[PDB]
């Protein structure tokens, strides 16, 4: 599995006086509490677009083709598909329920707040980990361990023919699903990071330089 943690930056509007923004809030973490209701102006108009999530929903608006609006909806807001651009008349009719979201697989880090009146436009960081898998053949070699990231040229798996080997894409966390069997060796794991060792085969207890 390759997780390509793609990133974007989207806005939202809150209750001004209600303390509803904390930095100790990570994926699957709280935002805002109990404004009955929300209906305020996210002032823009554009062609309707919506993209799916497990628990979430973006709304992008391309008037012509430029991305005029990018505002994310944490679940607990009642979306409507193709409404709004009557006079740009506060379409973001995302109903503020008594709970909030809390995006479990997408992390909410940075924060920015311009304060006025009833609401604050917030701009943050959005990284959702895309689970995409590959399948290795008998003649394919896993050059990558049980979890590490990767560069755009940082080849992952080598096969017999240079014809379509598993080349590296944009950065992704490398996890492994299906082994062909499992070794249970009674041993001791000793990780190293910086410098070089004594090779496989020799005797140690505790020996010298390990």
């Amino acid at each position: 599995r390759v997780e390509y943690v793609k990133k974007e930056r989207a806005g939202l509007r809150l209750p001004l006086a209600a303390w509803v923004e904390k930095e100790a809030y990570k994926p699957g973490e709280i935002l805002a509490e109990l404004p009955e209701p929300y209906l305020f102006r996210a002032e823009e108009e554009g062609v309707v677009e919506l993209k799916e999530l497990e628990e979430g929903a973006f709304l992008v608006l391309r008037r012509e083709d430029e991305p005029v609006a990018t505002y994310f909806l944490p679940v607990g807001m009642t979306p409507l598909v193709v409404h709004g651009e009557i006079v740009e008349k506060g379409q973001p009719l995302a109903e503020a329920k008594g709970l909030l979201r809390m995006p479990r697989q997408v992390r909410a880090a940075q924060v920015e707040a311009e304060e006025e009146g009833e609401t604050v436009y917030l701009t943050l960081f959005l990284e959702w980990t895309e689970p995409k898998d590959y399948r290795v053949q008998p003649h394919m070699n896993v050059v990558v361990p049980e979890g590490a990231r990767v560069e755009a040229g940082d080849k992952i798996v080598a096969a017999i023919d240079p014809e379509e080997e598993v080349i590296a894409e944009a950065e992704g966390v490398v996890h492994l699903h299906e082994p062909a069997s499992i070794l249970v060796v009674k041993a001791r794991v000793y990780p190293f990071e910086d410098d070089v060792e004594v090779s496989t085969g020799d005797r140690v207890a505790p020996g010298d330089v390990l």
Partner: protein, 313 residues
């Protein structure tokens, strides 16, 4: 106990612990072997040492400790004191250069895991050479000499697997030695399947024809055998002799050989050598005596050669 089943439960027990997965496990080991192949070559450049010297220091440290001192070109060297000098000069080469070592170790060690797992192949190859002239343990060990001699050569790059690549070399060392150590005399490589081929027409005529018909091979009887009424005599006891000195041997061939080369060189070498070596070097023939002339001129020049050779006018 009796050593028929012991080599079997000795083979089939690590071949039962490692019955190679036909692609994953088989191709993994062949790669590491070739991984260790080139890593040793690259270590031979960095250090300035023989490649087979390096492969052999690896072999000694993998098996723990042994006294198996032999190298092509070099027969011996101080083993237990110097292999560790070699292992520590390897501890000095940096991070870039020690990984060749780490791969060279894992590669030759996988070479043994490769072989040790593919010996049930040898069990069923030598099983079709049962009554051939060698005991069944001589056969497997000649078969295990082939599967080892097939590991130097295998190229996993070409996709055909090792289970069918080694059947050839195994059946090549078996048929190597059956032609050697089966009878007392070192028999020709030829006469093996010439004797073996009459033995499979004799059983395809004796099946039916009932006759024993018309138109350098026999089997030794031991020296001690109770003759008579299964009594105490041994058969060497009734052999008196023909003579002791065995003359006209050395004093004859000494004249015989030197007076040959005399006339042999006094006529044209293209003449005299055509038969010197046809009738005298390997075989015989005259359907192909000819290095490139008609079957009629060779008979022409052959006979005419001898005649001026016999008597000169």
């Amino acid at each position: 106990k009796i050593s028929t089943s012991d080599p079997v439960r000795q083979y089939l027990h690590e071949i039962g612990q490692v019955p190679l997965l036909t692609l994953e496990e088989e191709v993994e080991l062949a790669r590491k072997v070739e991984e260790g192949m080139e890593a040793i070559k690259k270590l031979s450049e960095i250090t300035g040492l023989d490649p087979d010297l390096i492969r052999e220091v690896v072999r000694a440290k993998i098996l723990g400790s042994a006294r198996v001192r032999h190298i092509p070109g070099l027969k011996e060297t101080l083993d237990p004191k110097t292999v560790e000098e070699i292992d520590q000069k390897l501890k000095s080469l940096p991070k870039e250069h020690k990984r060749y070592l780490h791969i060279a170790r894992e590669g030759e060690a996988a070479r043994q895991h490769l072989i040790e797992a593919n010996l049930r192949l040898v069990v069923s190859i030598a099983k079709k050479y049962t009554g051939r002239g060698l005991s069944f343990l001589d056969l497997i060990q000649e078969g295990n000499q082939g599967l080892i001699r097939a590991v130097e050569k295998f190229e996993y790059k070409r996709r055909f697997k090792f289970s069918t690549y080694a059947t050839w070399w195994i059946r090549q060392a078996i048929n190597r030695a059956i032609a050697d150590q089966a009878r007392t005399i070192r028999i020709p490589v030829h006469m093996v399947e010439t004797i073996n081929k009459l033995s499979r027409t004799a059983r395809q005529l004796q099946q039916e024809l009932g006759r024993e018909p018309t138109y350098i091979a026999q089997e030794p009887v031991s020296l001690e055998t109770p003759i008579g009424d299964e009594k105490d005599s041994f058969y060497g006891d009734f052999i008196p002799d023909e003579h002791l000195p065995s003359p006209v041997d050395a004093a004859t061939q000494s004249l015989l050989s030197e007076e040959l080369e005399k006339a042999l060189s006094k006529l044209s070498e293209r003449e005299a050598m055509v038969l010197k070596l046809r009738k005298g070097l390997i075989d015989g023939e005259e359907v192909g005596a000819f290095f490139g002339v008609t079957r009629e001129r060779i008979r022409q020049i052959e006979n005419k050669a001898l005649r001026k050779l016999k008597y000169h006018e």
